[PDB]
Amino acid sequence: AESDRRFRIILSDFMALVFFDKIILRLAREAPGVSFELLPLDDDPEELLRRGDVDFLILPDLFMSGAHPKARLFEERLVCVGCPTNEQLQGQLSLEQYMSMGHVAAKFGRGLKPSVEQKRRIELVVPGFNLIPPLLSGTNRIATIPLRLVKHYERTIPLRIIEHPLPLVSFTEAVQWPALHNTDPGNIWMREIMIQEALRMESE
Amino acid sequence: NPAESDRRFRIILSDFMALVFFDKIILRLAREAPGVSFELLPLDDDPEELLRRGDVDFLILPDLFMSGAHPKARLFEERLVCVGCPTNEQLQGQLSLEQYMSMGHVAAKFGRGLKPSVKRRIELVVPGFNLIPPLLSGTNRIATIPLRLVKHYERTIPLRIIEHPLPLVSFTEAVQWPALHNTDPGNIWMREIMIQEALRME
Ligand SMILES: COc1ccc([C@@H]2CC(=O)c3c(O)cc(O)cc3O2)cc1O
Numbered sequence: 001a002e003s004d005r006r007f008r009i010i011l012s013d014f015m016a017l018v019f020f021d022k023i024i025l026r027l028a029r030e031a032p033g034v035s036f037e038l039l040p041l042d043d044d045p046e047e048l049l050r051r052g053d054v055d056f057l058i059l060p061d062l063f064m065s066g067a068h069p070k071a072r073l074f075e076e077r078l079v080c081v082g083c084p085t086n087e088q089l090q091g092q093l094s095l096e097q098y099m100s101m102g103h104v105a106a107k108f109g110r111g112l113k114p115s116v117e118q119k120r121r122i123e124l125v126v127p128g129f130n131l132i133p134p135l136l137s138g139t140n141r142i143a144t145i146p147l148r149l150v151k152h153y154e155r156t157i158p159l160r161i162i163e164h165p166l167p168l169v170s171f172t173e174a175v176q177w178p179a180l181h182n183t184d185p186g187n188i189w190m191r192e193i194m195i196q197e198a199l200r201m202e203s204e
Numbered sequence: 205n206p207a208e209s210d211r212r213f214r215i216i217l218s219d220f221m222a223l224v225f226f227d228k229i230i231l232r233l234a235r236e237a238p239g240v241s242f243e244l245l246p247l248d249d250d251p252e253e254l255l256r257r258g259d260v261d262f263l264i265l266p267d268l269f270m271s272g273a274h275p276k277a278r279l280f281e282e283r284l285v286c287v288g289c290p291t292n293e294q295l296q297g298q299l300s301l302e303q304y305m306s307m308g309h310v311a312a313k314f315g316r317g318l319k320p321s322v323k324r325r326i327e328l329v330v331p332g333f334n335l336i337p338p339l340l341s342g343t344n345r346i347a348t349i350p351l352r353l354v355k356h357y358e359r360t361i362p363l364r365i366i367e368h369p370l371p372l373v374s375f376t377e378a379v380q381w382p383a384l385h386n387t388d389p390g391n392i393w394m395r396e397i398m399i400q401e402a403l404r405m406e
């Protein structure tokens with residue numbers, strides 16, 4: 001906790017904003033010499049996990065392979081959202097109506113792996129999750145995104161949750177580390193801190 | 205009539221330009237061209253290869269970072285300010301260049317880090333500009349970012365702008381299109397709309 005180690009983490013802009021922010025906050029107190037490079041999700045993360053060029057990979061666990069140690073962070077529900085200004089979004093929407101509307105969707109980098117949800121007519125593609133609410137605001141487009149993201153934006157961008165009529169989908173966000181680092185003291189320390197925070201979040 | 209087209213435009217730009225500028229484009233064309241669609245592409249590898257193959261319609265970037273092989277147009281002037289957290293104690297007052305070089309710094313790296321931003325101890329590197337205010341809030345780290353970005357987060361994330369002490373630095377955001385598309389009617393239509401919106405942003 002008195003180190004000057006630089007950790008490298010691969011994660012979504014969503015996970016950076018809604019979760020890792022807690023880590024940076026806490027450690028700015030508990031370990032003020034520890035630094036971070038947050039890397040964008042784009043290429044197979046495995047290549048970097050096998051070589052040990054990254055300390056951590058945060059991803060929903062369905063997208064990880066079984067060749068590195070991983071740990072459950074928390075459950076994330078996927079909801080369908082729209083702009084309060086949208087008329088059709090007033091009332092209940094039929095799965096048929098969903099597939100009849102214009103969609104905003106996130107494509108991470110070169111789109112190696114697919115969005116947990118994805119056919120819909122996508123009229124807006126963006127490099128992450130976080131730009132989706134602002135670029136959706138004021139149009140008749142809908143999107144499907146983490147429920148923790150909609151809450152982060154509650155006081156900033158009002159969003160109408162319309163998923164109530166469609167399938168209930170939830171994934172479990174998780175953290176993975178290289179097996180070559182399973183006994184690194186820095187790695188176990190950061191690991192345990194991340195899991196602590198994720199449990200706090202599971203309570204919410 | 206391109207206002208009734210179903211063309212999909214591909215644009216390369218920063219999360220900053222997506223959030224403070226292209227949003228206006230998407231907003232306006234939602235009523236003026238309800239079928240035109242967009243794929244916003246992240247800044248990563250040399251955009252010159254996508255421009256020389258006409259694989260995208262537009263690249264939005266500060267003009268110092270563009271080459272002279274493709275036609276481009278001035279969008280607007282963007283000031284670069286130094287920001288910190290109101291809760292930072294040593295940010296109450298003025299910050300010397302030496303003092304600045306003695307503090308922790310949050311910075312943006314785009315993709316593989318092929319291009320530098322416009323001797324600092326960078327304690328946090330993040331893949332764009334937009335995550336910088338949130339990840340900075342509540343720490344003693346500072347950053348340098350477009351002043352239009354600070355104004356966007358003014359009501360959500362309070363930030364302290366440090367201005368008087370360090371140098372005044374501003375660049376010019378611009379738009380570029382492939383030379384092979386200089387005549388494309390669709391390209392000119394979107395291009396000119398983009399220019400109109402930039403002028404309203406002084
Ligand atoms: C290697 O390329 C990829 C890996 C993982 C993803 C998934 C894709 C995805 O749906 C996703 C998510 O819903 C939440 C999250 O925190 C991170 C996510 O990333 C996309 C990619 O393009």
Ligand SMILES: COc1ccc([C@@H]2CC(=O)c3c(O)cc(O)cc3O2)cc1O
Pocket residue numbers: 011012013016038039040041042108126127128131217218219222244245246247248314331332
């Ligand atoms: C998956 O992790 C991330 C993905 C994208 C970002 C932002 C996300 C984003 O929207 C973006 C963009 O439009 C242009 C660009 O050049 C870089 C961008 O990166 C931050 C992340 O942490």
Ligand SMILES: COc1ccc([C@@H]2CC(=O)c3c(O)cc(O)cc3O2)cc1O
Pocket residue numbers: 217218220221247248249250251264265266269313314315316317318319320321322377
């Ligand atoms: C293809 O590689 C790159 C191209 C341009 C950049 C610049 C880097 C940069 O400083 C910059 C900016 O100040 C404003 C903006 O809107 C977009 C910017 O992107 C970074 C890259 O990694």
